[PDB]
């Protein structure tokens, strides 16, 4: 009755977003059901045949923007990455979207807690928000990551996707 699996640390971000860890095959009915259009995907091993046939099968176009899985106090997220991801993410046509790295903790709270900033949250909701998935491997690396991150190039893009007006 009850088998349907949600990948690791899987959530709703917002309308048409959603953030999780590295699917499995085990997921894969799961997200079947989110209809899925893309998935940005933040790292830079390639992606496995099982879930790139998966892709191929469900019509989901894949948006690779691999950023090296650095350890603190060694963490040098690049602001490149994040901003092309954030382009592809303020895109409705690519709506729905699932966003994912290994553990859906550091990369993918980087890009999520800048989308953040976008829709106006104050610094510490955003931080609470990334902490509540990075539990005790939460990183103040990445925090900082987001408090300095500039989105003045995006203040243009109309949000009208989003729950929040
Ligand atoms: O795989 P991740 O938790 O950056």
Same mark, same amino acid.
């Given at each position: 009755?009850?088998?349907?699996?949600?990948?690791? #640390?899987?959530?709703?971000?917002? #309308?048409?977003?959603? %953030?999780? +860890?590295?699917?499995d095959?085990?997921?894969?009915?799961?997200?079947?059901?989110?209809?899925?259009?893309?998935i940005?995907?933040?790292? @830079?091993? @390639?992606?496995?045949?099982?879930?790139?046939?998966?892709?191929?099968?469900?019509?989901? %176009?894949?948006?690779?923007? +691999?950023?090296?899985?650095?350890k603190? @106090?060694?963490?040098?997220? @690049?602001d490149? =990455?994040? %901003?092309?991801?954030?382009?592809?993410?303020?895109?409705? =046509? #690519?709506?729905?979207?699932?966003?994912?790295?290994?553990?859906?903790?550091?990369?993918?709270?980087?890009?999520?807690?800048?989308?953040? =900033?976008?829709?106006?949250?104050?610094?510490?909701?955003?931080?609470?928000?990334?902490? %509540?998935?990075?539990?005790? =491997?939460?990183?103040?690396?990445?925090?900082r990551?987001?408090?300095?991150?500039d989105?003045?190039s995006?203040?243009?893009?109309?949000? *009208?996707?989003?729950? *929040?007006?």
């Open positions: 009755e009850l088998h349907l699996i949600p990948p690791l #640390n899987f959530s709703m971000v917002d #309308n048409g977003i959603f %953030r999780s +860890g590295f699917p095959s085990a997921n894969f009915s799961f997200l079947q059901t989110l209809g899925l259009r893309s940005i995907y933040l790292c @830079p091993e @390639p992606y496995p045949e099982s879930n790139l046939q998966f892709l191929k099968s469900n019509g989901i %176009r894949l948006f690779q923007f +691999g950023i090296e899985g650095n603190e @106090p060694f963490v040098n997220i @690049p490149h =990455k994040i %901003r092309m991801a954030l382009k592809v993410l303020l895109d409705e =046509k #690519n709506h729905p979207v699932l966003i994912h790295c290994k553990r859906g903790k550091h990369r993918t709270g980087c890009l999520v807690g800048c989308l953040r =900033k976008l829709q106006k949250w104050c610094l510490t909701s955003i931080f609470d928000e990334y902490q %509540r998935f990075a539990a005790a =491997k939460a990183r103040v690396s990445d925090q990551f987001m408090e300095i991150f989105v003045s995006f203040s243009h893009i109309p949000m *009208s996707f989003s729950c *929040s007006i």
